Coordinates of C-alpha atoms and ligand atoms in Angstrom, one line a residue:
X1 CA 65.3 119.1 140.9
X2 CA 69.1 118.5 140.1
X3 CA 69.6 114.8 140.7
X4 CA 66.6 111.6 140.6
X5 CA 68.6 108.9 142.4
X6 CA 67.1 105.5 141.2
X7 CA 66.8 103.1 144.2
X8 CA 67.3 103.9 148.6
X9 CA 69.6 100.4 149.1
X10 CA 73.3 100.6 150.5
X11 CA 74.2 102.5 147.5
X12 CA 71.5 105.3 147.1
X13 CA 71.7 106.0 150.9
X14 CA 75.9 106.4 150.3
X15 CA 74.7 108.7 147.3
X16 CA 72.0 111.1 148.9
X17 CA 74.8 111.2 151.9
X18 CA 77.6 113.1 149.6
X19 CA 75.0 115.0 147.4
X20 CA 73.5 116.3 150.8
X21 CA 77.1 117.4 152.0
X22 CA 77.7 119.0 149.1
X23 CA 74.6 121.3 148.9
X24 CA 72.9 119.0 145.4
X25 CA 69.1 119.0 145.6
X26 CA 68.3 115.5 144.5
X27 CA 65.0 112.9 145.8
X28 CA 65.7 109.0 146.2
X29 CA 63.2 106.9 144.6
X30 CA 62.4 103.5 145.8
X31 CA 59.7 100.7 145.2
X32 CA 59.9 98.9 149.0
X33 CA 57.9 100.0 151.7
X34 CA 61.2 101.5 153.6
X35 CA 65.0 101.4 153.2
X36 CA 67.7 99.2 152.6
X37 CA 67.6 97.1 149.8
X38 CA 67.6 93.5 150.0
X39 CA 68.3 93.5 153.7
X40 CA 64.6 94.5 154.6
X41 CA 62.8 91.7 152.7
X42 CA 63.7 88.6 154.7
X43 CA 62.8 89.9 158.0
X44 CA 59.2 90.8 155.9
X45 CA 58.9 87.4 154.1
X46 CA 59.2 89.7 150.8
X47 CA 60.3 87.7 147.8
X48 CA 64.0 88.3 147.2
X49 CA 67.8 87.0 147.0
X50 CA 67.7 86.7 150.8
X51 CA 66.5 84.4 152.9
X52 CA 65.6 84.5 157.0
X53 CA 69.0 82.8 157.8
X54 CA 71.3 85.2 156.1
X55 CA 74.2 86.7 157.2
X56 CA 77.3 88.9 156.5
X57 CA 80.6 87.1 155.1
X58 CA 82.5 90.2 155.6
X59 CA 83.6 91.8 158.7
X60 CA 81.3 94.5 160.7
X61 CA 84.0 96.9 160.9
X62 CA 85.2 96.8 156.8
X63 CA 81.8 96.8 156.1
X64 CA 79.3 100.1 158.3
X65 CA 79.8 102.9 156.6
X66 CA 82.8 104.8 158.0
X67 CA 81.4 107.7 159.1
X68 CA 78.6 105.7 161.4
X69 CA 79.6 102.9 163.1
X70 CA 77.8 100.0 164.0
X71 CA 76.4 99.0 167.8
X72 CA 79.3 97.7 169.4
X73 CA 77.4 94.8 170.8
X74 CA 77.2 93.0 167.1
X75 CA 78.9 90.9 166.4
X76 CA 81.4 89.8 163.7
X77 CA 78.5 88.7 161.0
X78 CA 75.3 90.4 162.4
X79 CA 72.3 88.9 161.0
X80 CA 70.1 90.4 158.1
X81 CA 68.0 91.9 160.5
X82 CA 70.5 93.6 162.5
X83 CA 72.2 95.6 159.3
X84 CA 68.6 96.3 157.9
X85 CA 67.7 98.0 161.5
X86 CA 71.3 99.9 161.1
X87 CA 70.6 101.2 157.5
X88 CA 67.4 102.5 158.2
X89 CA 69.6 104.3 161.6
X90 CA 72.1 106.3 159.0
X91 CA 68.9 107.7 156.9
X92 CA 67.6 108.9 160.3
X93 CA 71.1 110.8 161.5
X94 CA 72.1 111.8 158.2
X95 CA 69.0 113.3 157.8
X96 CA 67.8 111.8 154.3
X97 CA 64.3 110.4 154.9
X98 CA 62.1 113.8 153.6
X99 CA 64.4 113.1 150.3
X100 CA 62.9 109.7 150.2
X101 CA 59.2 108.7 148.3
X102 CA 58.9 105.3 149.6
X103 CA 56.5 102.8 147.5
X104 CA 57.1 105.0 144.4
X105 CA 58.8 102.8 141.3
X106 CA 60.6 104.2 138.3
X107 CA 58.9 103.1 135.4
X108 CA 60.9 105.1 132.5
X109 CA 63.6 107.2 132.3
X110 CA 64.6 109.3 128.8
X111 CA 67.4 111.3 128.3
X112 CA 66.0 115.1 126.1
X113 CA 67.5 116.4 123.1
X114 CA 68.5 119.7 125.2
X115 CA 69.9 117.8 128.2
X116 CA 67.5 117.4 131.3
X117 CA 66.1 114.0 131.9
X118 CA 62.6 112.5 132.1
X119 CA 61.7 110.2 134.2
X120 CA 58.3 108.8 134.9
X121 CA 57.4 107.2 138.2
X122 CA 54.5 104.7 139.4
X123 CA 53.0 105.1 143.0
X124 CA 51.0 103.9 145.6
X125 CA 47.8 104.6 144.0
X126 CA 49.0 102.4 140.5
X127 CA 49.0 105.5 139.0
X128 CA 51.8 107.7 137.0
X129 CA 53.7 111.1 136.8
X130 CA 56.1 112.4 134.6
X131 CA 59.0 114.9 135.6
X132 CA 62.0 116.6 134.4
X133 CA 65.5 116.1 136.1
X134 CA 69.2 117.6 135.4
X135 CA 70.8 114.4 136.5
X136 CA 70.1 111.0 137.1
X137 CA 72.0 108.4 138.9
X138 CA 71.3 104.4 139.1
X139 CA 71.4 102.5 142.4
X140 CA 69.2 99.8 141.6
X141 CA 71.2 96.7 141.7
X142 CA 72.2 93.6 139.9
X143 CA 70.2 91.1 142.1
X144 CA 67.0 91.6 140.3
X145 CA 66.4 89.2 137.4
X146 CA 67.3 85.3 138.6
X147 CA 68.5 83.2 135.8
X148 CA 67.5 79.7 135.8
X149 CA 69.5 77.2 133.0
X150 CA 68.3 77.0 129.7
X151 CA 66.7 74.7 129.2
X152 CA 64.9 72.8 131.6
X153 CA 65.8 68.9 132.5
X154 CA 63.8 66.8 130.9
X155 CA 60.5 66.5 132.0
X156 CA 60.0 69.0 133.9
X157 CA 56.5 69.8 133.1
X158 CA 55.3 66.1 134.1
X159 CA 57.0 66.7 137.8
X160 CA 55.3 66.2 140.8
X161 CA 56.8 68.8 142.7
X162 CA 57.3 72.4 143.1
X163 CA 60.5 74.0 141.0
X164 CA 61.5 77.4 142.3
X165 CA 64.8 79.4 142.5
X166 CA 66.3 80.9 145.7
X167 CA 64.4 84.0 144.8
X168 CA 61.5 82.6 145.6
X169 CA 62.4 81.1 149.2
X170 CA 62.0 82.1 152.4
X171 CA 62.7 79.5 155.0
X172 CA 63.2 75.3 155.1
X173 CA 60.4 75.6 157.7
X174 CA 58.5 75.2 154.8
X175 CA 60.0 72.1 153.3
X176 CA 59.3 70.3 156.8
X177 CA 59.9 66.2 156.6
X178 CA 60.3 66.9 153.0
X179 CA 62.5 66.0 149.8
X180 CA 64.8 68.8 148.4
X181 CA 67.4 69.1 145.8
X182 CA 69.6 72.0 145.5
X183 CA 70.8 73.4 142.2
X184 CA 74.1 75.2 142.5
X185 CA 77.6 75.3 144.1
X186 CA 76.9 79.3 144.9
X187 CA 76.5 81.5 147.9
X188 CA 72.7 80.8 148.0
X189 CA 73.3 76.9 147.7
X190 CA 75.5 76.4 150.5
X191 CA 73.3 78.8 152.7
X192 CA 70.1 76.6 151.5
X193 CA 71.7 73.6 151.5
X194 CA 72.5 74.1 155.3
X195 CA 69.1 75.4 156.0
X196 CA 67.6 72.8 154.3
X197 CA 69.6 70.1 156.1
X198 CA 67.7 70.8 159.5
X199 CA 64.4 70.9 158.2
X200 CA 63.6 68.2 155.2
X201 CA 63.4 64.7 156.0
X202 CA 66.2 64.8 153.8
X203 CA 69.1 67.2 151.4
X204 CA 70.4 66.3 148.1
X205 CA 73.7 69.3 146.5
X206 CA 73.3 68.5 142.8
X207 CA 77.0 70.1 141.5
X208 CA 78.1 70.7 137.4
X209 CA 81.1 72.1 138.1
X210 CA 83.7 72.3 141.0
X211 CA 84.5 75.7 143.0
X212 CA 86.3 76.2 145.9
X213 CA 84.9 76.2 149.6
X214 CA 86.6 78.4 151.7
X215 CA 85.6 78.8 155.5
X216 CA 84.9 82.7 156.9
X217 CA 88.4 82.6 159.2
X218 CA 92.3 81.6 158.8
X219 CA 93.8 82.3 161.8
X220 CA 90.7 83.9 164.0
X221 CA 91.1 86.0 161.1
X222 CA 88.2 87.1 158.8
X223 CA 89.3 86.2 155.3
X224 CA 89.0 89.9 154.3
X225 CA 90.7 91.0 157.8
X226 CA 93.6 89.0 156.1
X227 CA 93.6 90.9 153.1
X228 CA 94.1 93.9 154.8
X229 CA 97.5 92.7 156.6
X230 CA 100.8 94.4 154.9
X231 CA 102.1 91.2 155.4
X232 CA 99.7 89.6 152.9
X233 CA 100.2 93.0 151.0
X234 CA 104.2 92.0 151.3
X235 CA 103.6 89.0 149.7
X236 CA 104.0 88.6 145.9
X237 CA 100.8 87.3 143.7
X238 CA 101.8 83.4 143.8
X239 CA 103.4 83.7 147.3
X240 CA 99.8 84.2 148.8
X241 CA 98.1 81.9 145.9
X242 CA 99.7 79.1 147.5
X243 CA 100.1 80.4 151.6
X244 CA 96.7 79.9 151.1
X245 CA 96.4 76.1 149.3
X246 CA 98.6 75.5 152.1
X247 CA 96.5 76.4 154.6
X248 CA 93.3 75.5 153.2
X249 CA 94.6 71.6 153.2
X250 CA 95.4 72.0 157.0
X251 CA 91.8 73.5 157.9
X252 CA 89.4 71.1 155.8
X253 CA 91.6 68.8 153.8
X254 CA 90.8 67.7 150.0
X255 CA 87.7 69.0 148.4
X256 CA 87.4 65.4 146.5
X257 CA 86.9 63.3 150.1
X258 CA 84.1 65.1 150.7
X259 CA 82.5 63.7 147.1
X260 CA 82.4 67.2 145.5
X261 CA 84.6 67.8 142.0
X262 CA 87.8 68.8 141.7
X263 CA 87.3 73.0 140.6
X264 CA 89.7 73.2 137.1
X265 CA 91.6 76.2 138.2
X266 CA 93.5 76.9 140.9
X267 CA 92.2 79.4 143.7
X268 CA 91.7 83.1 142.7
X269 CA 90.9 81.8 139.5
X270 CA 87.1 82.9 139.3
X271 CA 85.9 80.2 142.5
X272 CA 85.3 80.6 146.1
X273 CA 81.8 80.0 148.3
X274 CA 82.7 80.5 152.0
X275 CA 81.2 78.5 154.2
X276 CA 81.6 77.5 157.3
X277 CA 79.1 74.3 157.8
X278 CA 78.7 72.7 154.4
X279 CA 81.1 70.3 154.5
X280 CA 80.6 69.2 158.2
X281 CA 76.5 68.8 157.3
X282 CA 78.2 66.6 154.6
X283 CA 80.1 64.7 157.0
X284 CA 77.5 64.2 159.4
X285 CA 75.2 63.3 156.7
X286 CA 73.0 66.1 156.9
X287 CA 73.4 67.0 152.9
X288 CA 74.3 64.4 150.4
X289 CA 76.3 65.2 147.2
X290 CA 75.0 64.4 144.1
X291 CA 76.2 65.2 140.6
X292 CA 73.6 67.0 138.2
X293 CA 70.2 66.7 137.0
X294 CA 69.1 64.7 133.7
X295 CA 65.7 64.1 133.7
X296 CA 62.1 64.2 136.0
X297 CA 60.5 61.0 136.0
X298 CA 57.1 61.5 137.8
X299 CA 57.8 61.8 141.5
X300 CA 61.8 61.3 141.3
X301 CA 64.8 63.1 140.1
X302 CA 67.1 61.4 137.6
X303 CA 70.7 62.6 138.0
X304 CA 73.1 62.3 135.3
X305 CA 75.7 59.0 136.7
X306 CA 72.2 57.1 137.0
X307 CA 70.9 57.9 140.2
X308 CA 67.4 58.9 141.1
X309 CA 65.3 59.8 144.2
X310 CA 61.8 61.1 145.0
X311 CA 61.7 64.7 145.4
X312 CA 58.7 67.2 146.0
X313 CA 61.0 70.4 145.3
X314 CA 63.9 71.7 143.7
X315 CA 65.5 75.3 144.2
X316 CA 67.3 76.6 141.6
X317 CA 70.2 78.4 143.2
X318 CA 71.9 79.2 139.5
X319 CA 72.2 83.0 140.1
X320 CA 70.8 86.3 139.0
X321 CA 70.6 88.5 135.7
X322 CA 71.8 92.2 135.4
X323 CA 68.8 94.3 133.4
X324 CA 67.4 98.0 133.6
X325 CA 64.1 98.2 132.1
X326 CA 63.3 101.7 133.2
X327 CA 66.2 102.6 130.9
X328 CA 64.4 101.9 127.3
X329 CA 67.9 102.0 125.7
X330 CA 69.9 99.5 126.8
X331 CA 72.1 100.1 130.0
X332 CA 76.0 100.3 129.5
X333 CA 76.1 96.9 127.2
X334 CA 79.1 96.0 124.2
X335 CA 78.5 94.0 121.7
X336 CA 79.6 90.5 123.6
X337 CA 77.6 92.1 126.6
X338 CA 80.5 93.3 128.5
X339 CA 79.9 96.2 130.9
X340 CA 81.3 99.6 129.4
X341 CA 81.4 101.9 131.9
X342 CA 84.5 104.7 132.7
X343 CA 85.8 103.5 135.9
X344 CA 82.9 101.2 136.0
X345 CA 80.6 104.0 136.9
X346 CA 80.5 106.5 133.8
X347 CA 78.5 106.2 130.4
X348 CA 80.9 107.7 127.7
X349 CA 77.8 108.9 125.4
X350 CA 75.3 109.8 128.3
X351 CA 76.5 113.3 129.5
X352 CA 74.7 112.9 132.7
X353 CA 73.9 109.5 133.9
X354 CA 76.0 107.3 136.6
X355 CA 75.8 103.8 138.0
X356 CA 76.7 103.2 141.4
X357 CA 77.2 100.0 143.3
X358 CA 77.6 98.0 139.7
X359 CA 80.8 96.8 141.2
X360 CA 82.0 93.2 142.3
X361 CA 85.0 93.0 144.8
X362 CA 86.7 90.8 146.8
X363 CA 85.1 91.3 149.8
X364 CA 83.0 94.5 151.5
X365 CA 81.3 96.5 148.6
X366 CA 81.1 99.4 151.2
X367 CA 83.7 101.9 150.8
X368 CA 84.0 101.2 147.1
X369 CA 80.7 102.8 146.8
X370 CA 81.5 105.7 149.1
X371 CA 84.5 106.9 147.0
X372 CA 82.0 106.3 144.0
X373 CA 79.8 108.4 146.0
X374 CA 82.0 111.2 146.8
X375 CA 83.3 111.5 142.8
X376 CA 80.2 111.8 141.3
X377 CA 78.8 114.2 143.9
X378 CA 81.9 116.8 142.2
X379 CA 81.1 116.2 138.9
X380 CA 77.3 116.8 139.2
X381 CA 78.0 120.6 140.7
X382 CA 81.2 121.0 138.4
X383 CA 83.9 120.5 140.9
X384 CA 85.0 117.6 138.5
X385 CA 85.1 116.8 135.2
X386 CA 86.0 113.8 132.9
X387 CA 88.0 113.0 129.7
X388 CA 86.9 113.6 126.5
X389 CA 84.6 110.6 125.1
X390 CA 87.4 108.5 123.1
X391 CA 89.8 109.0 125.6
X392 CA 87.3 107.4 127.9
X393 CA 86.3 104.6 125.6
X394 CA 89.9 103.4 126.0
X395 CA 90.4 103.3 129.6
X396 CA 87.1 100.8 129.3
X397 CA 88.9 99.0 126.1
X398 CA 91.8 98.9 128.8
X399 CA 90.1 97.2 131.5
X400 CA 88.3 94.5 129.2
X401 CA 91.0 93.2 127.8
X402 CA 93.0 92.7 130.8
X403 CA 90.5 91.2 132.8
X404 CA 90.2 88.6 129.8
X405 CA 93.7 87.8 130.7
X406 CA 92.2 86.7 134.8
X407 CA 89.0 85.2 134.1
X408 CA 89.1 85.1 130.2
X409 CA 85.7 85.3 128.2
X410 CA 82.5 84.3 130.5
X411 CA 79.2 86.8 131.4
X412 CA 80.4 88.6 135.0
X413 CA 83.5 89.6 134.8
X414 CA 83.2 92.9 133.5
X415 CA 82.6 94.4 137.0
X416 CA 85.2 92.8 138.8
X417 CA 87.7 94.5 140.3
X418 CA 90.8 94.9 143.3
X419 CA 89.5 96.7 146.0
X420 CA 93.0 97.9 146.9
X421 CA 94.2 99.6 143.7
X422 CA 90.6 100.9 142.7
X423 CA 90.1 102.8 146.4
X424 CA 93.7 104.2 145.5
X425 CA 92.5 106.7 142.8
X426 CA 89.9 108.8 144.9
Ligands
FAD501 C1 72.9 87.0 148.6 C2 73.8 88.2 148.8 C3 74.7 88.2 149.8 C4 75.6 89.3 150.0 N1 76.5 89.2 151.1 C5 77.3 90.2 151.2 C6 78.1 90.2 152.3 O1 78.1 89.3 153.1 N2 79.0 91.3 152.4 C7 79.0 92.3 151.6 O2 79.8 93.2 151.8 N3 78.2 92.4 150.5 C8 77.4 91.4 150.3 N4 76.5 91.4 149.3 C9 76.5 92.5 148.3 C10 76.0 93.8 148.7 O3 75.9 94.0 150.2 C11 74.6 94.0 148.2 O4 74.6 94.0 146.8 C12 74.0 95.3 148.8 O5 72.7 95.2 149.2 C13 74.2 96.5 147.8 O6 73.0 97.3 147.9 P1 72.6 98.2 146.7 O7 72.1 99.5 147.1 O8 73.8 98.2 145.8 O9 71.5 97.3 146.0 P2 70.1 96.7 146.5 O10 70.3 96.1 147.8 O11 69.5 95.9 145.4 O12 69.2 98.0 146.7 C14 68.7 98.6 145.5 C15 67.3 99.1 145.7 O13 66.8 99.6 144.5 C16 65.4 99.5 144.5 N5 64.8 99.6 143.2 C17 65.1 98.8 142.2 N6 64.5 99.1 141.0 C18 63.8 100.2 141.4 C19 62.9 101.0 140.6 N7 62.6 100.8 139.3 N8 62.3 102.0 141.2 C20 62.6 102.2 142.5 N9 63.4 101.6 143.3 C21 64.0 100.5 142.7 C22 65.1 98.2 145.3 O14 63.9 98.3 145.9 C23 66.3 98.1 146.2 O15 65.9 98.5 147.5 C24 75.6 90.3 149.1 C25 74.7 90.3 148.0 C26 73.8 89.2 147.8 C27 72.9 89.2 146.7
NAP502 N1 78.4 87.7 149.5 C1 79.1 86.7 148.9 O1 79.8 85.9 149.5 C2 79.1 86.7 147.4 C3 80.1 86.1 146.7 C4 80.1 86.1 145.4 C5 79.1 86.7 144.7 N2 78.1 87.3 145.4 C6 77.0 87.9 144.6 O2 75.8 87.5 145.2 C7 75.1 86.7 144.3 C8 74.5 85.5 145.0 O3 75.3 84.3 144.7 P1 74.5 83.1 144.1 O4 75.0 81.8 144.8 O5 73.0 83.3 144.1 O6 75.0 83.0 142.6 P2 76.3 82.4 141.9 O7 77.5 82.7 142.8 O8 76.3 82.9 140.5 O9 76.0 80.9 141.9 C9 75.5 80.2 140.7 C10 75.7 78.7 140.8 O10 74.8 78.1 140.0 C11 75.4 77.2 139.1 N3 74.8 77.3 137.8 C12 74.6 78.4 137.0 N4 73.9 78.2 135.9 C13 73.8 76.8 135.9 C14 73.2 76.0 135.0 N5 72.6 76.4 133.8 N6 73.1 74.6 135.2 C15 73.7 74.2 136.4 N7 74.3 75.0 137.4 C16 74.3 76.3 137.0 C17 76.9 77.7 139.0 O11 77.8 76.7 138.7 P3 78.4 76.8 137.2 O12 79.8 77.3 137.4 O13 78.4 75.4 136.6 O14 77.6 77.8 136.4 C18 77.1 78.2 140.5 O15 77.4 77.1 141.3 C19 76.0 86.3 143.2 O16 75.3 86.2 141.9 C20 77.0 87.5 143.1 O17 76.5 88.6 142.3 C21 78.1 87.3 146.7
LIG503 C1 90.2 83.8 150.7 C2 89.8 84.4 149.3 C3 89.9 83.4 148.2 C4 88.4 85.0 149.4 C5 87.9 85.3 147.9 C6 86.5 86.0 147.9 C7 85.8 86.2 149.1 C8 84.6 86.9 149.1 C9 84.1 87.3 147.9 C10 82.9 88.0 147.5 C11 81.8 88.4 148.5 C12 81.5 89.9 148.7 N1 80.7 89.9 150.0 C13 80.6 90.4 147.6 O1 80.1 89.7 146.7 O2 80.2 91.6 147.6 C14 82.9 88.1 146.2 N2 84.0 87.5 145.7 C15 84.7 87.1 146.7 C16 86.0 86.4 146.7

């Protein structure tokens, strides 16, 4: 009755957890067959951003929610199934599920002229109801849409293969004494890549642009366990850049011998898979670099120095898109397409919407969403309140045009942010 909240991943389940504490009725929507976002589809062969070998890059510990920790026997990275198993364990103790229509889709949501919400929701049975709400929140995701390049290669339509992106796949024991290319330096690629090299007859990395591979550990350390130190914290902003060049050389050396390109910008500057086996299936020959895709000629791939190769697949591993389409009018967007949300949570002409989870950090996303959590569960009751509208359309003019001075003018960036400072002020 008081709050629809869009969407039972990581970030729904943080929500219904402070609006429950708090005494907020509210119901949690979600289209899957049960909880926890995209780590239940892998170990169901659903069609998603996963895939069955994928695993956390952030440390257990900095990344369960604080309030329930995780079985002591997993381990530092516990596999997709072992965190979708532990979501669905929270929902049980902290009491949620009865809140929770499984299988039930939002379809439409409408704000009314005198305040409540309507949102309309598709079922089991293909069918549809409408309802009213006093407030709404968004946990839906940014993982939804995948964006393949525009255009196509060449030729693409006379191919002999199968094109697909990393949405679509599963596992390499599919690609079996196969062909592959892989589009992409990302955090799919790699993790395909790697797959792939242990199941095709044979793995081809086709790179645009360079970025830098990082492995999971400095020191025994997770790399996020090292950004917890003070004495990382002690350091100043180009002490650590370079601590870290530094060490980088002494773990894996030059990214050049290894016959990937140079990234333009140093590290922190908008580029780092981690990784701890793509170089080494490089070495052993497992993957071979190649350098970007110009044409398809029948059966082969032409790459752009000249070289070709028969394939019978490419995944496209180019990333996702960020859309709402249950929100007719279109979800926090500027003119450029930045994101312009107060605090990156807060519509300054919506008097009753939030977004939670649209976040990016360095590192765990976890208790970034549980302060995001905890804020908007005062505000929905009254226990919190917010500036008037201009003075909130200029903290957001704020944060744009400093992060122009980090990453300067690309699509993403307008959710990044510093997990340390942004924790600080909640
Ligand atoms: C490949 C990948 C690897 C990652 N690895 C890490 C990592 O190692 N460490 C880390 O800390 N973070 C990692 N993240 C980020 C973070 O853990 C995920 O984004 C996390 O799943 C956040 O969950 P969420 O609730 O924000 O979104 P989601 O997982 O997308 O959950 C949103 C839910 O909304 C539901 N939904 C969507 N639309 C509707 C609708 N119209 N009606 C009803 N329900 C709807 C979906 O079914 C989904 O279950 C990774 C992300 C990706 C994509
Ligand atoms: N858990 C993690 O470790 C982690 C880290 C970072 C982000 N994430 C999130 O999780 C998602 C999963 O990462 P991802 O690997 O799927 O996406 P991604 O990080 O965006 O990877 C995209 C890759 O595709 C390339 N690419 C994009 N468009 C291209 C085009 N038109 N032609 C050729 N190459 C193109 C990019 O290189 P170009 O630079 O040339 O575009 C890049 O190498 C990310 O989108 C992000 O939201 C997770
Ligand atoms: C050593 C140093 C250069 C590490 C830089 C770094 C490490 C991890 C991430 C992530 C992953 C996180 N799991 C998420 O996307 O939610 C996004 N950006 C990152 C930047």
């Amino acid at each position: 009755m008081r709050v629809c909240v869009i969407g039972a991943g990581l970030s729904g389940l943080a929500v219904g957890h402070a609006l429950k504490e708090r005494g907020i009725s509210f119901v949690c929507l979600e289209k899957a067959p049960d909880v926890g976002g995209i780590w239940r589809q892998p170990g169901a062969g659903e069609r998603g951003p996963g895939y069955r070998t994928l695993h956390l890059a952030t440390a257990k510990q900095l990344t369960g929610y604080a309030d329930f920790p995780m079985p002591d026997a997993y381990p530092l990275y516990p596999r997709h199934s072992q965190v979708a198993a532990y979501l669905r364990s929270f929902a049980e103790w902290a009491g949620l599920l009865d809140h929770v229509e499984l299988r039930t889709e939002v379809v439409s949501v409408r704000q009314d002229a005198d305040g409540p919400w309507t949102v309309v929701s598709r079922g089991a049975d293909g069918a549809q109801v409408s309802r009213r709400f006093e407030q709404v929140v968004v946990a839906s995701g940014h993982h939804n849409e995948p964006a393949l390049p525009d255009p196509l290669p060449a030729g693409a339509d006379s191919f002999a293969g199968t094109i697909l992106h990393s949405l679509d796949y599963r596992d390499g024991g599919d690609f079996a004494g196969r062909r592959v290319v892989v589009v992409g330096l990302g955090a799919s690629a790699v993790d395909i890549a790697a797959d792939l090299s242990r199941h095709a007859e044979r793995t081809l990395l086709s790179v645009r642009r360079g970025l830098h591979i990082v492995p999971k550990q400095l020191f025994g350390m997770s790399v996020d366990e090292i950004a917890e130190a003070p004495w990382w914290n002690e350091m100043s902003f180009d002490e650590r850049r370079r601590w870290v060049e530094q060490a980088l050389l002494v773990a894996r050396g030059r990214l050049s011998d290894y016959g990937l390109p140079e990234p333009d910008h140093p590290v922190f500057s908008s580029a780092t898979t981690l990784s701890d086996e793509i170089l080494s299936r490089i070495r052993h020959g497992a993957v071979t670099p190649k350098p970007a895709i110009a044409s398809f000629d029948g059966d082969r791939v032409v790459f752009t120095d000249g070289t070709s190769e028969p394939a019978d697949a490419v995944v496209y591993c180019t990333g996702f898109h960020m859309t709402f389409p249950f929100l007719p009018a279109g979800c926090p967007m500027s003119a450029d397409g930045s994101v312009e949300l107060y605090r990156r949570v807060v519509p300054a002409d919506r008097p009753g919407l939030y977004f939670v989870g649209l976040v990016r950090p360095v590192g765990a996303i976890t208790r970034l969403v549980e302060a995001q959590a905890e804020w908007v569960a005062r505000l929905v009751d009254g226990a919190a309140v917010l500036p008037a509208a201009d003075q909130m359309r200029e903290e957001i003019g704020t944060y744009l045009t400093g992060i122009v001075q980090r990453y300067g003018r690309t699509e993403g960036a307008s959710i990044q942010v510093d997990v340390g400072p942004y924790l600080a002020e909640f």
